[PDB]
Amino acid sequence: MNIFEMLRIDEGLRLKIYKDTEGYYTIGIGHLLTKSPSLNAAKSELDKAIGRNCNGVITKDEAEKLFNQDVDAAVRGILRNAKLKPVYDSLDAVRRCALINMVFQMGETGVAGFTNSLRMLQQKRWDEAAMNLAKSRWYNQTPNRAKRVITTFRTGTWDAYK
Ligand SMILES: [Cl-]
Ligand SMILES: [Cl-]
Known part of the structure; x- marks a missing residue:
């Protein structure tokens, strides 16, 4: 078991924009897009994160890329805190x-x-x-x-x- 497997179990994987447990727009493996109520704002944030016109949907590969980024950011954040x-x-x-x-x-x-x-x-x-x-x-x-x-x-x- 490792961090990735661990988080994959706790967050799941979804290739289409969804609402998290708190009602925020999210995608992939627990990647929060925004806390705004606007699906558009979400859709916009998504494209900006992927760098393409996604229309609220991404591929697995893309989900995994965001996941690698997020895990790295978390570790680095801890180490800086x-x-x-x-x-x-x-x-x-x-x-x-x-x-x-x-x-x-x-x-x-x-x-x-x-x-x-x-x-x-x-x-x-x-x-x-x-x-x-x-x-x-x-x-x-x-x-x-x-x-x-x-x-x-x-x-x-x-x-x-x-
Ligand atoms: Cl739970
Ligand atoms: Cl309490």
């Missing part, structure tokens, strides 16, 4: 993937706001951090996915995904 970097540095390989997952989903900023949880992960207090992570909007809105990420942090293994 004063709050995130130290946490990342302190973790083992598996749990690092869990932190990338959260960043991909919620943004650097979003994750950086899980102050208490971050401190606990940094102190290697697995069970405590898991419980704290659970007390969040995130957990309440997408519980199955949250639970998978949380178990990953708790155990340090890929069991939730197997």
Whole structure:
């Protein structure tokens, strides 16, 4: 198992513009296009991201390209973030993937706001951090996915995904 496989399971793959769980226009493997209510704005953002007239549809290849970009951006973002970097540095390989997952989903900023949880992960207090992570909007809105990420942090293994 690796980050790509992990995220492919949590996000799915769709080749046509769709609304995410929060109602935002998205495509491919969890690639947010926009938070605007306008399908056109979405369609516009899409073409700009692909560089062609897409008419709201893309190919698999294109979906995978956006995915590679997004994963790279997430890692780089973590590594640039004063709050995130130290946490990342302190973790083992598996749990690092869990932190990338959260960043991909919620943004650097979003994750950086899980102050208490971050401190606990940094102190290697697995069970405590898991419980704290659970007390969040995130957990309440997408519980199955949250639970998978949380178990990953708790155990340090890929069991939730197997
Ligand atoms: Cl809560
Ligand atoms: Cl879910």
